Structure 1
Amino acid sequence: IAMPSVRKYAREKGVDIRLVQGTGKNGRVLKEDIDAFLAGG
Structure 2
Amino acid sequence: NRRVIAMPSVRKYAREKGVDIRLVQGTGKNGRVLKEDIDAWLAGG
Deviation at 1:17, TM superposition (A): 1.4
Deviation at 1:21, TM superposition (A): 2.6
8 Å Cα contact 1:10/1:34 also seen in 2: yes
Tell me which residue corresponds to 1:2. 6
Runs of 5+ in structure 2 lacking a partner? none
8 Å Cα contact 1:21/1:37 also seen in 2: no
CA distance in 2, matches of 1:17, 1:2: 7
Name whichever structure is richer in helix by fraction: 1
8 Å Cα contact 1:21/1:34 also seen in 2: no
8 Å Cα contact 1:21/1:36 also seen in 2: no
Structure-1-length-normalised TM-score: 0.73
